[PDB]
Paper text:
Interestingly, the globular part of uL2 is present on domain III only after core formation in state C_L2 and binding can occur later in state C-CP_L28/L2. Late 50S assembly, apart from core-stabilizing incorporation of uL2, involves stable binding of bL9 and bL28 in state C-CP_L28, which stabilizes the base of the L1 stalk.
Author numbering:
A (entry chain S): 1 to 86, 96 to 110
B (entry chain R): 1 to 103
C (entry chain Q): 1 to 117
D (entry chain J): 1 to 81, 84 to 142
E (entry chain L): 2 to 35
F (entry chain 0): 1 to 56
G (entry chain E): 52 to 59, 71 to 201
The structure:
Amino acid sequence: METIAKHRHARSSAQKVRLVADLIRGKKVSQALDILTYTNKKAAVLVKKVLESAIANAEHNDGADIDDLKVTKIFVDEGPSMKRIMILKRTSHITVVVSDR
Amino acid sequence: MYAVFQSGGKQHRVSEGQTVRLEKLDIATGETVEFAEVLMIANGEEVKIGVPFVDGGVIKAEVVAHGRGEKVKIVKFRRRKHYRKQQGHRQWFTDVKITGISA
Amino acid sequence: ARVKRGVIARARHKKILKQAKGYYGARSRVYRVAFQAVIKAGQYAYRDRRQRKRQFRQLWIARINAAARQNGISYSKFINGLKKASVEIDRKILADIAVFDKVAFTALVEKAKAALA
Amino acid sequence: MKTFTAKPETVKRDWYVVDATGKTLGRLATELARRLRGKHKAEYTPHVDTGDYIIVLNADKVAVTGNKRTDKVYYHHTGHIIKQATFEEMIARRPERVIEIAVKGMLPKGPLGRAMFRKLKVYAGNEHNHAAQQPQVLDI
Amino acid sequence: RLNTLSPAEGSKKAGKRLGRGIGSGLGKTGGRGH
Amino acid sequence: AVQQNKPTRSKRGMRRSHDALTAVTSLSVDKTSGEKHLRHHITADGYYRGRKVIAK
Amino acid sequence: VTGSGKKPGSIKSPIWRSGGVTFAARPQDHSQKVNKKMYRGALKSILSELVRQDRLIVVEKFSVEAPKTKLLAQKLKDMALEDVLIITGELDENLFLAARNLHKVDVRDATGIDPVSLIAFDKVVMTADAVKQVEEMLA
RNA sequence: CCCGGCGAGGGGAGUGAAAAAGAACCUGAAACCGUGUACGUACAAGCAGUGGGAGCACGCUUAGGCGUGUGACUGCGUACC
RNA sequence: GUGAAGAGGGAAACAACCCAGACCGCCAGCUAAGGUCCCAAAGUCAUGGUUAAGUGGGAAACGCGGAAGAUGUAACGGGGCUAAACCAUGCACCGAAGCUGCGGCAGCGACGCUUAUGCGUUGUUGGGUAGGGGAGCGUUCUGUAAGCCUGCGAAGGUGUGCUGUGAGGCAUGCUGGAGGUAUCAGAAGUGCGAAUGCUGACAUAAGUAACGAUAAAGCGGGUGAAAAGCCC
RNA sequence: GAACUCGCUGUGAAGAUGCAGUGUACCCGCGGCAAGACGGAAA
């Protein structure tokens, strides 16, 4: 049993978001929130928001057991891009799956 | 307790109860064949050979299945010469269950 | 009546890429270089199959020379004795008997020495 | 049946000790290279180290053949914008260096060659500390 | 027999379509050389 | 001063192998508020070293 | 093809998007001249083949008093025929009036006999006058 | 209904046969960017493949030395038009 | 004679130097040139001799001298060989796709049955540019087809296995939810890897220049979740 | 075009990162020289 949260069309680069995500994958949620909230990357706020939404959905629709939450899968993938004249803006999708076990 | 014999022109060292691959032969599946051609017999004391075609060795071979070998693709190509051909190929093979060694 | 080439090109690319697996990135993903990779691999396989007989012949020669030296006889003299004694055992059989059972090879070389002169 | 292949963990390798004093350097070098290669053993395959460990002692009294004591010289370049070493000087300092150079020349070049060369143990003095492995002293 | 009639052998020939690969014989230069 | 070849994925991965960030792993719990906070910082509630601060 | 010949070669090129096809077909009739002797010989050969194959049935006269499709269906069922081609001489209003409704059953005159219909249809129903008319036509 | 910022977006429930049809809306390979899985690599040099090949996990014959995933190591090997 | 239009083996790497004209496959053998100290497979083989200088392992005329080889040994391929160099002879071995041993595929002459032929075979061919000739596979539509399969699952995409000397074909899990189509004949807008070919998407150098007159910015409060570029 | 992109000797469409021999080198980034760079240009 796991809860999936995917934020689409993120307004940030697909690399820096990946750099932020690399530091949180495989870490306990309790300390993951604290460590992520105290970083120097603007992309960190999007990750915090999506993780907060994921945990809120998990606790509302399923047993909270907030202490025993562990992140299993998390990844960022490049999203839609539009061509214009000054260039393409880079968008990303952020996906996080959290399971108690 | 093994033996050495050639049937399709290829030397084979086969022990009792060991399945070996031989070239295709016009041998029916329902009948056994005799390979009177022997070259060496392995036992507690090996039987030396002074001349080939030793009559003291009798080998019974029973074909159990038929088929072709693994498909192999041969490609002949030349650089800058616009010459290139490709063709698949396979070879028939037979398996014989060897029982009993004559000393 | 216009016809669409999508199906034929799709099938050709699929079949050619299927044989091209594990060629260090681009060669296994890009058709342009994948064609060269597969054709060169086929030619290399053909030539290596041709040379495999020679390679295994060299391996058997080395093993037989090692066995003869261990038994205390030169490889050339051993071959001369074996052939002049009316023995048609293939080098593969000699290597197999030498590696597996040492007593049999020792007896064979002793017999060759007996029928050497 | 497929050709027999020696398994690296199944190889049984012993210890051999050879003295180069009063011996032709070329012949003994070739013999050591052959023994390291494992080609002497019947169960030899040119893909794994089937040879035996070799120990060389008393390399100071190696017998020079002909007038190569001074005529023969080796040049090595450090790779800069050259180093000169005379045969007599290197012989007086450490004959093990020239012995190792010759052995490396004998062995095939490559990582496998380096791995096989790792088995050589050359000592300037007659005495050695490897006697704990009950090495078999063979004179050749 | 509803529709099975076919032309006799040799009466109909598929012809030659040059400039189609190398397996079809002539495929380059259009047959006029360089 | 211009490119002549096409670097593959390996070069991009290796060059990007050193930009990975690291966790501070230095959070401290305030004695009074009992809430995690960074070392040598000021808590949101307005506490530091156990004494009172402006806490605006 | 409408466009512009100004150099950007030219936009109206076969190798560019929305470009004209260099080998563009043109409207030309595909009809091929067929000799009268060839047509007569083909008709004779097919007619001779049909009789030897027992695929041709000859009747004195096939007609219906009134243009009733149901009656024609019953008559065909009596003869155990479902896909047959009727060939006759003078056109009859009662029979011709009902011919298009049945796709497997159609009536034709000897003057405009079509070989493709004869070949495709399993069986052909002749007439006492129709056979004489067609044999005179071929001669 | 909840998180989110009364944004966007997401989750649950429900409609809908399908939401794996959600308005960036039929079917969705490749070039391109990843996750998890099995393997190899931090002392080894060159069209990066091939032949042999111990090892490392799995289905198997419910061992019988079979195949699948990678290939430590070496002989050979200077792209296409 | 070779390349042109022939691969292979040896000479370090080679198209004109030597041997040798590749139908395919088999963990078989015998040879040509070339080698038998290791690298690297075979004689550290046997007999009659030269070498003291590494000449061998580069050097004409002239009697060991005449005679210098270079980015780093660099004119034995490296070692070292006083014979592991060289002159002569003997028996051997290694040695290619050359020959033979086994299996298989296609064509071409010669025959006895035989016919719109398969056998018994008898010999041979199967490297190939330009070029010529012959034989075939894939797709649209048309008649076949108001036949057949198909919401119990068609195409299209995708994974597996089998099959054919080949282009290909066959069955099957999966998103997929509506068409496809046997055999036989007829036409191509018919098979893509390149022409600085065109259209849509994307890696690339890379999170690298730089963020554009060097007039210059701040403090408290307010709105805003988030304020140093918003307001006071 | 793709590179698991080292230095010398010889060969080489004639000064070779990719051919033969030899030697060096744990993997990967950061600021400078530009000696290479057949990319422009400099008789």
